[PDB]
Amino acid sequence: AGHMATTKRVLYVGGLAEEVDDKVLHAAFIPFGDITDIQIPLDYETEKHRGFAFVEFELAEDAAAAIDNMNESELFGRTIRVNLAKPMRIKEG
RNA sequence: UAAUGUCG
């Protein structure tokens, strides 16, 4: 039919600690399905983390299960938030 | 929960 939203197999993440790395999100997101890419962009002004990230699955049903089994979770002693990404020109086609 | 998806 079509994509679940303005994006496909992508998940926004927030509430992360400044110590969280792409290996932490990979270890947290892998049991729900095959991960295909991960992003943790720094502030682009001071080279520091902002407590948010993105994760991307090989399948869309794995991203839906990840929303259903990782939202409101807790990483590094802080509560996280997880959902599909907001509308914007994505790096993908 | 919000992005300049550290340019691949």
JSON list of C-alpha atoms (C1' of nucleotides) in Angstrom, two decimals:
[
{"chain": "A", "resi": 1, "resn": "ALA", "atom": "CA", "xyz": [0.00, 0.00, 0.00]},
{"chain": "A", "resi": 2, "resn": "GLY", "atom": "CA", "xyz": [2.50, 2.63, 1.19]},
{"chain": "A", "resi": 3, "resn": "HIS", "atom": "CA", "xyz": [4.79, 3.85, 3.99]},
{"chain": "A", "resi": 4, "resn": "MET", "atom": "CA", "xyz": [3.55, 4.16, 7.60]},
{"chain": "A", "resi": 5, "resn": "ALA", "atom": "CA", "xyz": [4.38, 7.90, 7.53]},
{"chain": "A", "resi": 6, "resn": "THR", "atom": "CA", "xyz": [6.47, 10.61, 5.80]},
{"chain": "A", "resi": 7, "resn": "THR", "atom": "CA", "xyz": [9.38, 8.15, 6.32]},
{"chain": "A", "resi": 8, "resn": "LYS", "atom": "CA", "xyz": [10.12, 4.40, 6.12]},
{"chain": "A", "resi": 9, "resn": "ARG", "atom": "CA", "xyz": [11.72, 2.11, 8.74]},
{"chain": "A", "resi": 10, "resn": "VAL", "atom": "CA", "xyz": [13.10, 5.15, 10.65]},
{"chain": "A", "resi": 11, "resn": "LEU", "atom": "CA", "xyz": [12.73, 5.84, 14.37]},
{"chain": "A", "resi": 12, "resn": "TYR", "atom": "CA", "xyz": [13.36, 9.03, 16.29]},
{"chain": "A", "resi": 13, "resn": "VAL", "atom": "CA", "xyz": [14.90, 8.66, 19.76]},
{"chain": "A", "resi": 14, "resn": "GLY", "atom": "CA", "xyz": [15.05, 11.21, 22.60]},
{"chain": "A", "resi": 15, "resn": "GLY", "atom": "CA", "xyz": [15.81, 11.51, 26.33]},
{"chain": "A", "resi": 16, "resn": "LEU", "atom": "CA", "xyz": [19.20, 9.82, 25.79]},
{"chain": "A", "resi": 17, "resn": "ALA", "atom": "CA", "xyz": [22.21, 10.49, 28.02]},
{"chain": "A", "resi": 18, "resn": "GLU", "atom": "CA", "xyz": [25.29, 12.24, 26.58]},
{"chain": "A", "resi": 19, "resn": "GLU", "atom": "CA", "xyz": [27.18, 8.93, 27.01]},
{"chain": "A", "resi": 20, "resn": "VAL", "atom": "CA", "xyz": [24.90, 7.04, 24.58]},
{"chain": "A", "resi": 21, "resn": "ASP", "atom": "CA", "xyz": [26.61, 5.95, 21.34]},
{"chain": "A", "resi": 22, "resn": "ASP", "atom": "CA", "xyz": [25.53, 4.15, 18.16]},
{"chain": "A", "resi": 23, "resn": "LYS", "atom": "CA", "xyz": [26.63, 0.86, 19.76]},
{"chain": "A", "resi": 24, "resn": "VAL", "atom": "CA", "xyz": [24.18, 1.45, 22.65]},
{"chain": "A", "resi": 25, "resn": "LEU", "atom": "CA", "xyz": [21.26, 2.05, 20.29]},
{"chain": "A", "resi": 26, "resn": "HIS", "atom": "CA", "xyz": [22.32, -0.98, 18.22]},
{"chain": "A", "resi": 27, "resn": "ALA", "atom": "CA", "xyz": [22.42, -3.20, 21.32]},
{"chain": "A", "resi": 28, "resn": "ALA", "atom": "CA", "xyz": [19.04, -1.78, 22.42]},
{"chain": "A", "resi": 29, "resn": "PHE", "atom": "CA", "xyz": [17.28, -1.97, 19.02]},
{"chain": "A", "resi": 30, "resn": "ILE", "atom": "CA", "xyz": [18.62, -5.25, 17.57]},
{"chain": "A", "resi": 31, "resn": "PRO", "atom": "CA", "xyz": [16.25, -7.77, 19.30]},
{"chain": "A", "resi": 32, "resn": "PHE", "atom": "CA", "xyz": [13.23, -6.30, 17.43]},
{"chain": "A", "resi": 33, "resn": "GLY", "atom": "CA", "xyz": [14.70, -6.96, 13.96]},
{"chain": "A", "resi": 34, "resn": "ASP", "atom": "CA", "xyz": [17.53, -6.30, 11.51]},
{"chain": "A", "resi": 35, "resn": "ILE", "atom": "CA", "xyz": [18.94, -2.80, 11.99]},
{"chain": "A", "resi": 36, "resn": "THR", "atom": "CA", "xyz": [20.31, -1.18, 8.81]},
{"chain": "A", "resi": 37, "resn": "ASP", "atom": "CA", "xyz": [21.63, 2.24, 9.90]},
{"chain": "A", "resi": 38, "resn": "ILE", "atom": "CA", "xyz": [21.99, 4.44, 13.03]},
{"chain": "A", "resi": 39, "resn": "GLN", "atom": "CA", "xyz": [22.62, 8.16, 13.58]},
{"chain": "A", "resi": 40, "resn": "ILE", "atom": "CA", "xyz": [23.71, 10.25, 16.58]},
{"chain": "A", "resi": 41, "resn": "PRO", "atom": "CA", "xyz": [24.39, 13.74, 15.19]},
{"chain": "A", "resi": 42, "resn": "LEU", "atom": "CA", "xyz": [26.22, 16.11, 17.54]},
{"chain": "A", "resi": 43, "resn": "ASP", "atom": "CA", "xyz": [25.25, 19.78, 17.96]},
{"chain": "A", "resi": 44, "resn": "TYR", "atom": "CA", "xyz": [27.10, 20.88, 14.77]},
{"chain": "A", "resi": 45, "resn": "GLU", "atom": "CA", "xyz": [28.31, 24.01, 16.62]},
{"chain": "A", "resi": 46, "resn": "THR", "atom": "CA", "xyz": [30.21, 22.64, 19.66]},
{"chain": "A", "resi": 47, "resn": "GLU", "atom": "CA", "xyz": [30.70, 18.94, 18.77]},
{"chain": "A", "resi": 48, "resn": "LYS", "atom": "CA", "xyz": [28.58, 17.67, 21.70]},
{"chain": "A", "resi": 49, "resn": "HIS", "atom": "CA", "xyz": [25.56, 15.34, 21.88]},
{"chain": "A", "resi": 50, "resn": "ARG", "atom": "CA", "xyz": [21.99, 16.70, 22.27]},
{"chain": "A", "resi": 51, "resn": "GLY", "atom": "CA", "xyz": [20.41, 13.62, 23.92]},
{"chain": "A", "resi": 52, "resn": "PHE", "atom": "CA", "xyz": [18.56, 12.49, 20.77]},
{"chain": "A", "resi": 53, "resn": "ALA", "atom": "CA", "xyz": [19.28, 10.09, 17.90]},
{"chain": "A", "resi": 54, "resn": "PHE", "atom": "CA", "xyz": [17.79, 8.12, 15.00]},
{"chain": "A", "resi": 55, "resn": "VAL", "atom": "CA", "xyz": [17.68, 4.38, 14.21]},
{"chain": "A", "resi": 56, "resn": "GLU", "atom": "CA", "xyz": [16.74, 2.69, 10.92]},
{"chain": "A", "resi": 57, "resn": "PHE", "atom": "CA", "xyz": [15.54, -0.87, 10.24]},
{"chain": "A", "resi": 58, "resn": "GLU", "atom": "CA", "xyz": [15.82, -3.18, 7.23]},
{"chain": "A", "resi": 59, "resn": "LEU", "atom": "CA", "xyz": [12.05, -3.87, 7.54]},
{"chain": "A", "resi": 60, "resn": "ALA", "atom": "CA", "xyz": [9.13, -1.59, 8.47]},
{"chain": "A", "resi": 61, "resn": "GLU", "atom": "CA", "xyz": [7.45, -4.18, 10.71]},
{"chain": "A", "resi": 62, "resn": "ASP", "atom": "CA", "xyz": [10.66, -4.32, 12.77]},
{"chain": "A", "resi": 63, "resn": "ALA", "atom": "CA", "xyz": [10.45, -0.55, 13.27]},
{"chain": "A", "resi": 64, "resn": "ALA", "atom": "CA", "xyz": [6.78, -0.86, 14.28]},
{"chain": "A", "resi": 65, "resn": "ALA", "atom": "CA", "xyz": [7.65, -3.62, 16.77]},
{"chain": "A", "resi": 66, "resn": "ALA", "atom": "CA", "xyz": [10.55, -1.48, 18.04]},
{"chain": "A", "resi": 67, "resn": "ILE", "atom": "CA", "xyz": [8.13, 1.39, 18.72]},
{"chain": "A", "resi": 68, "resn": "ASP", "atom": "CA", "xyz": [5.85, -1.10, 20.49]},
{"chain": "A", "resi": 69, "resn": "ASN", "atom": "CA", "xyz": [8.68, -2.63, 22.58]},
{"chain": "A", "resi": 70, "resn": "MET", "atom": "CA", "xyz": [11.18, 0.22, 23.24]},
{"chain": "A", "resi": 71, "resn": "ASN", "atom": "CA", "xyz": [9.12, 3.40, 23.82]},
{"chain": "A", "resi": 72, "resn": "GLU", "atom": "CA", "xyz": [9.17, 4.79, 27.39]},
{"chain": "A", "resi": 73, "resn": "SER", "atom": "CA", "xyz": [12.24, 2.58, 28.07]},
{"chain": "A", "resi": 74, "resn": "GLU", "atom": "CA", "xyz": [15.24, 3.74, 30.14]},
{"chain": "A", "resi": 75, "resn": "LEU", "atom": "CA", "xyz": [18.86, 4.04, 28.92]},
{"chain": "A", "resi": 76, "resn": "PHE", "atom": "CA", "xyz": [21.80, 5.35, 30.98]},
{"chain": "A", "resi": 77, "resn": "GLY", "atom": "CA", "xyz": [19.47, 6.17, 33.90]},
{"chain": "A", "resi": 78, "resn": "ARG", "atom": "CA", "xyz": [17.13, 8.43, 31.84]},
{"chain": "A", "resi": 79, "resn": "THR", "atom": "CA", "xyz": [13.73, 7.77, 30.24]},
{"chain": "A", "resi": 80, "resn": "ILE", "atom": "CA", "xyz": [13.60, 7.68, 26.42]},
{"chain": "A", "resi": 81, "resn": "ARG", "atom": "CA", "xyz": [11.01, 8.50, 23.74]},
{"chain": "A", "resi": 82, "resn": "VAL", "atom": "CA", "xyz": [10.61, 6.63, 20.43]},
{"chain": "A", "resi": 83, "resn": "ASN", "atom": "CA", "xyz": [8.45, 7.17, 17.32]},
{"chain": "A", "resi": 84, "resn": "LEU", "atom": "CA", "xyz": [8.59, 7.69, 13.52]},
{"chain": "A", "resi": 85, "resn": "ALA", "atom": "CA", "xyz": [10.55, 10.72, 12.27]},
{"chain": "A", "resi": 86, "resn": "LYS", "atom": "CA", "xyz": [8.99, 14.14, 11.53]},
{"chain": "A", "resi": 87, "resn": "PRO", "atom": "CA", "xyz": [8.45, 15.30, 7.92]},
{"chain": "A", "resi": 88, "resn": "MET", "atom": "CA", "xyz": [11.60, 16.69, 6.27]},
{"chain": "A", "resi": 89, "resn": "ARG", "atom": "CA", "xyz": [13.78, 16.04, 3.21]},
{"chain": "A", "resi": 90, "resn": "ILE", "atom": "CA", "xyz": [15.45, 12.78, 4.29]},
{"chain": "A", "resi": 91, "resn": "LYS", "atom": "CA", "xyz": [18.90, 11.61, 3.14]},
{"chain": "A", "resi": 92, "resn": "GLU", "atom": "CA", "xyz": [17.10, 8.70, 1.41]},
{"chain": "A", "resi": 93, "resn": "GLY", "atom": "CA", "xyz": [15.25, 8.80, -1.93]},
{"chain": "B", "resi": 1, "resn": "U", "atom": "C1'", "xyz": [9.38, 13.30, 22.80]},
{"chain": "B", "resi": 2, "resn": "A", "atom": "C1'", "xyz": [12.85, 16.88, 17.52]},
{"chain": "B", "resi": 3, "resn": "A", "atom": "C1'", "xyz": [17.11, 17.11, 13.02]},
{"chain": "B", "resi": 4, "resn": "U", "atom": "C1'", "xyz": [22.82, 20.91, 10.63]},
{"chain": "B", "resi": 5, "resn": "G", "atom": "C1'", "xyz": [20.01, 12.29, 10.33]},
{"chain": "B", "resi": 6, "resn": "U", "atom": "C1'", "xyz": [28.99, 14.23, 11.65]},
{"chain": "B", "resi": 7, "resn": "C", "atom": "C1'", "xyz": [28.81, 14.02, 4.62]},
{"chain": "B", "resi": 8, "resn": "G", "atom": "C1'", "xyz": [28.45, 7.92, 4.09]}
]
